[PDB]
Amino acid sequence: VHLTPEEKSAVTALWGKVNVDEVGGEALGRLLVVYPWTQRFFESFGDLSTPDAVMGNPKVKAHGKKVLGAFSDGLAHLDNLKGTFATLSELHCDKLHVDPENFRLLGNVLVCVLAHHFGKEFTPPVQAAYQKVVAGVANALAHKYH
């Protein structure tokens, strides 16, 4: 994940004003709602049989924040995303066996969440840059599978 100084300014000015408590949870919820097969991994979270169940679940908004936590790490370390994610990769790959395709999905719904909370500030330049990072973190989590 290369990112020029312009892309970097773009991704970083953005991420700075992200409510780190909500955005994390809204992405997991929209993932669970939009791609409902991912719920097989989250039945221990409780009642998910409507979007309102899901969007309200305490477990959901609690696990999303962890998720964003890790994205913040990778934003910190683009030059070494494997390094950053190695532990996370064994988890999702060697232990959970999540299909890497769902890593791409979670990134793309994180991108929608971003466009939703930021409106016209989330120009197409800044999307382009953000698709990079998201591709890159999906690429890293997926390492142990490679």
């Binding site: 929209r30 709602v33 929608c112 466009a115 197409p124």
Partner: protein, 141 residues
């Protein structure tokens, strides 16, 4: 296969887009060319720059094709029969590319409709764009 609730959400989210449909198609297309530079392969003849009047004209086209599918949602295969032919059969558009466009369309709607882009309408609109895409890839599908 688009539930009654989905059809209702889609009619209504499309509704809000109203006369901005063409504008939104242009933005979506621009989002795709930038984020997914691999799609640019199919438009060597276009000037893909930012205020490009090629890209604006095409956004309108894409927005009108979609309004055609929304308006004919229970009968998309017939409504979009010609476009399929074009996409699936005369331009051979890699199927992968419909996912990328459908994603950028959703990012564009999310960016314009904060009130309407709930978790449910997002699920619906995802199901509609995927249907649409299944119709347009169906000459080798």
């Amino acid at each position: 296969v688009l539930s009654p609730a989905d059809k209702t959400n889609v009619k209504a989210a499309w509704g809000k887009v109203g006369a901005h449909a063409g504008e939104y198609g242009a933005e979506a297309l621009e989002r795709m060319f930038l984020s997914f530079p691999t799609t640019k392969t199919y438009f060597p003849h276009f000037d893909l720059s930012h205020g490009s009047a090629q890209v604006k004209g095409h956004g309108k086209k894409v927005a009108d094709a979609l309004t055609n599918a929304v308006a004919h949602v229970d009968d998309m295969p017939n409504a979009l029969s010609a476009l399929s032919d074009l996409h699936a059969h005369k331009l051979r558009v890699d199927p992968v590319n419909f996912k990328l466009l459908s994603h950028c369309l959703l990012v564009t709607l999310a960016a314009h409709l904060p009130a309407e882009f709930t978790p449910a309408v997002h699920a619906s609109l995802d199901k509609f764009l995927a249907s649409v895409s299944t119709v347009l890839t169906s000459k080798y599908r």
